[PDB]
Enzyme design. Structure first.
Site, PDB file in Angstrom:
ATOM      1  N   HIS A  40      -3.100  16.850 -72.003  1.00  0.00           N
ATOM      2  CA  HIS A  40      -3.591  15.690 -72.043  1.00  0.00           C
ATOM      3  C   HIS A  40      -4.718  15.674 -73.342  1.00  0.00           C
ATOM      4  O   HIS A  40      -5.356  14.549 -73.765  1.00  0.00           O
ATOM      5  CB  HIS A  40      -4.180  14.712 -71.089  1.00  0.00           C
ATOM      6  CG  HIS A  40      -5.506  15.006 -70.542  1.00  0.00           C
ATOM      7  ND1 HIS A  40      -5.709  15.862 -69.458  1.00  0.00           N
ATOM      8  CD2 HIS A  40      -6.803  14.705 -70.891  1.00  0.00           C
ATOM      9  CE1 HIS A  40      -6.874  15.887 -68.931  1.00  0.00           C
ATOM     10  NE2 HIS A  40      -7.810  15.150 -69.714  1.00  0.00           N
ATOM     11  N   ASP A  84       0.338  19.239 -66.829  1.00  0.00           N
ATOM     12  CA  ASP A  84      -0.895  19.069 -67.549  1.00  0.00           C
ATOM     13  C   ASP A  84      -1.457  20.303 -68.152  1.00  0.00           C
ATOM     14  O   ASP A  84      -2.247  20.712 -67.725  1.00  0.00           O
ATOM     15  CB  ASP A  84      -1.802  18.046 -67.220  1.00  0.00           C
ATOM     16  CG  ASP A  84      -2.606  17.728 -68.142  1.00  0.00           C
ATOM     17  OD1 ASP A  84      -2.630  17.901 -69.460  1.00  0.00           O
ATOM     18  OD2 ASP A  84      -4.150  17.331 -67.610  1.00  0.00           O
ATOM     19  N   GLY A 175     -14.811  15.521 -70.561  1.00  0.00           N
ATOM     20  CA  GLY A 175     -15.328  16.684 -71.498  1.00  0.00           C
ATOM     21  C   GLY A 175     -15.062  18.035 -71.108  1.00  0.00           C
ATOM     22  O   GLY A 175     -14.932  18.830 -71.975  1.00  0.00           O
ATOM     23  N   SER A 177     -12.092  18.646 -69.344  1.00  0.00           N
ATOM     24  CA  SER A 177     -10.683  18.672 -69.258  1.00  0.00           C
ATOM     25  C   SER A 177     -10.360  20.010 -70.193  1.00  0.00           C
ATOM     26  O   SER A 177     -10.663  20.080 -71.315  1.00  0.00           O
ATOM     27  CB  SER A 177     -10.258  17.461 -69.909  1.00  0.00           C
ATOM     28  OG  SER A 177     -10.447  16.258 -69.224  1.00  0.00           O
ATOM     29  N   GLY A 178      -9.163  20.570 -69.705  1.00  0.00           N
ATOM     30  CA  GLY A 178      -8.525  21.823 -70.263  1.00  0.00           C
ATOM     31  C   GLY A 178      -9.242  23.017 -70.078  1.00  0.00           C
ATOM     32  O   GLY A 178      -8.646  24.077 -70.399  1.00  0.00           O
TER      33      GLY A 178
HETATM   34  C1  LIG Z   1      -2.620   9.999 -61.577  1.00  0.00           C
HETATM   35  N1  LIG Z   1      -2.703   9.552 -62.893  1.00  0.00           N
HETATM   36  C2  LIG Z   1      -1.424   9.573 -63.567  1.00  0.00           C
HETATM   37  C3  LIG Z   1      -1.852   9.010 -65.187  1.00  0.00           C
HETATM   38  N2  LIG Z   1      -3.352   9.061 -64.929  1.00  0.00           N
HETATM   39  C4  LIG Z   1      -3.728   9.297 -63.680  1.00  0.00           C
HETATM   40  C5  LIG Z   1      -5.236   9.324 -63.655  1.00  0.00           C
HETATM   41  C6  LIG Z   1      -5.755   8.496 -62.486  1.00  0.00           C
HETATM   42  C7  LIG Z   1      -7.174   8.576 -62.511  1.00  0.00           C
HETATM   43  C8  LIG Z   1      -8.021   9.246 -63.074  1.00  0.00           C
HETATM   44  C9  LIG Z   1      -7.473   9.992 -64.316  1.00  0.00           C
HETATM   45  O1  LIG Z   1      -8.396  10.527 -65.060  1.00  0.00           O
HETATM   46  C10 LIG Z   1      -9.465  10.342 -65.533  1.00  0.00           C
HETATM   47  N3  LIG Z   1     -10.584  11.270 -65.305  1.00  0.00           N
HETATM   48  C11 LIG Z   1     -11.657  10.941 -66.125  1.00  0.00           C
HETATM   49  O2  LIG Z   1     -12.453  11.946 -65.794  1.00  0.00           O
HETATM   50  C12 LIG Z   1     -12.436  13.341 -65.187  1.00  0.00           C
HETATM   51  C13 LIG Z   1     -12.721  13.626 -63.981  1.00  0.00           C
HETATM   52  C14 LIG Z   1     -12.451  15.206 -63.686  1.00  0.00           C
HETATM   53  C15 LIG Z   1     -13.207  15.391 -62.534  1.00  0.00           C
HETATM   54  N4  LIG Z   1     -13.374  14.381 -61.475  1.00  0.00           N
HETATM   55  N5  LIG Z   1     -12.997  16.487 -61.707  1.00  0.00           N
HETATM   56  C16 LIG Z   1     -12.010  16.026 -64.766  1.00  0.00           C
HETATM   57  C17 LIG Z   1     -11.596  15.614 -65.749  1.00  0.00           C
HETATM   58  C18 LIG Z   1     -11.543  14.515 -66.166  1.00  0.00           C
HETATM   59  O3  LIG Z   1     -11.234  14.065 -67.457  1.00  0.00           O
HETATM   60  C19 LIG Z   1     -12.071   9.831 -66.576  1.00  0.00           C
HETATM   61  F1  LIG Z   1     -13.020   9.684 -67.150  1.00  0.00           F
HETATM   62  C20 LIG Z   1     -10.979   8.862 -66.868  1.00  0.00           C
HETATM   63  N6  LIG Z   1     -11.407   7.794 -67.597  1.00  0.00           N
HETATM   64  C21 LIG Z   1     -11.047   6.441 -66.954  1.00  0.00           C
HETATM   65  C22 LIG Z   1     -10.587   5.531 -67.999  1.00  0.00           C
HETATM   66  C23 LIG Z   1     -11.468   5.432 -69.250  1.00  0.00           C
HETATM   67  C24 LIG Z   1     -11.762   6.870 -69.808  1.00  0.00           C
HETATM   68  C25 LIG Z   1     -12.346   6.955 -70.959  1.00  0.00           C
HETATM   69  O4  LIG Z   1     -11.841   7.569 -72.049  1.00  0.00           O
HETATM   70  O5  LIG Z   1     -13.282   5.856 -71.318  1.00  0.00           O
HETATM   71  C26 LIG Z   1     -12.213   7.810 -68.599  1.00  0.00           C
HETATM   72  C27 LIG Z   1      -9.827   9.158 -66.443  1.00  0.00           C
HETATM   73  F2  LIG Z   1      -8.876   8.075 -66.324  1.00  0.00           F
HETATM   74  C28 LIG Z   1      -6.064   9.929 -64.435  1.00  0.00           C
END
Ligand SMILES: Cn1ccnc1-c1cccc(Oc2[nH+]c(Oc3cc(C(=N)N)ccc3O)c(F)c(N3CCC[C@@H](C(=O)O)C3)c2F)c1
Ligand SMILES: [Ca+2]
Length: 223
Positions: A40, A84, A175, A177-178
């Protein structure tokens, strides 16, 4: 990283910053010419920054190397985040030293309860945005599959694992990520996703590297 600590300069020698005029993702150095990160995080015009501590100041020890090619797993699904993982080939080999070193690939998967070190330059706040200058670290255990599944019903694949704290306040975040999840000197995970950051009952989700060893090796061998 939310609820972490300052790592200390070059204490995590395999940590890499992916840069496109700003830091956007982490990665791990696995050999002198290859980095592993999350699919990603893919984009064109990636510059790999090795030996970094403060990402906003040239302090010495940094090595800036352009990516020659980025290899996204062919089965990566952006909707589910399954598979991923991405491999990045450096245009020239990194000069390995005290401060810039590779991390080993696992020989076996890690069990629940195993303590790991997670690191990055991601967001340090739950509520709000605050990006650090220096590398942050977090020690966190791998959770059982049962807890992970309970937290994210129907969203957990065999290529993911949960690590962190159910009580909240300590996690990776946007931030990071990866970047790496290192357990007993082996790269076990890649920071992938989570619901928010450091929220109660919503631990971080990580790409399970032990499932990709053969793929990594085969891919590097042919490139
Ligand atoms: C399960 N699945 C299938 C496809 N996507 C997903 C999901 C579902 C839920 C969350 C997912 O990941 C996400 N992880 C995030 O945050 C993270 C959280 C963690 C952690 N808690 N350990 C690690 C890495 C991340 O990148 C987001 F900020 C996020 N955003 C929310 C939308 C706006 C975006 C931004 O650029 O403004 C930030 C997002 F969708 C990804
Ligand atoms: Ca720097």
């Amino acid at each position: 990283i939310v609820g972490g600590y300052t790592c200390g300069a070059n204490t995590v020698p395999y940590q890499v910053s992916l840069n496109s005029g700003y830091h956007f993702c982490g990665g791990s150095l696995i050999n002198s010419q290859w980095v592993v990160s999350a699919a990603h995080c893919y984009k064109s015009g990636i510059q790999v920054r090795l030996g970094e501590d403060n990402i906003n100041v040239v302090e010495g020890n940094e090595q800036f190397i352009s990516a020659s090619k980025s290899i996204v797993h062919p089965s990566y699904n952006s909707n589910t985040l399954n598979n991923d993982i991405m491999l990045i080939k450096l245009k020239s080999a990194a000069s390995l030293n005290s401060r810039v070193a590779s991390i080993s690939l696992p020989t076996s998967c890690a069990s629940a309860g195993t303590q790991c070190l997670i690191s990055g330059w991601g967001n340090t706040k739950s509520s709000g945005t605050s990006y650090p200058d220096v590398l942050k670290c977090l020690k966190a255990p791998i959770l059982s599959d049962s807890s992970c599944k309970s937290a994210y019903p129907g969203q957990i694949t065999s290529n993911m694992f949960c690590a962190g704290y159910l009580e909240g306040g300590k996690d990776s975040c946007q931030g990071d990520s990866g970047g790496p999840v290192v357990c007993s000197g082996k790269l076990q995970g890649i920071v992938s996703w989570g619901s928010g950051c450091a929220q109660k009952n919503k631990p971080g989700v990580y790409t399970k590297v032990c499932n990709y060893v053969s793929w990594i090796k085969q891919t590097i061998a042919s490139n």
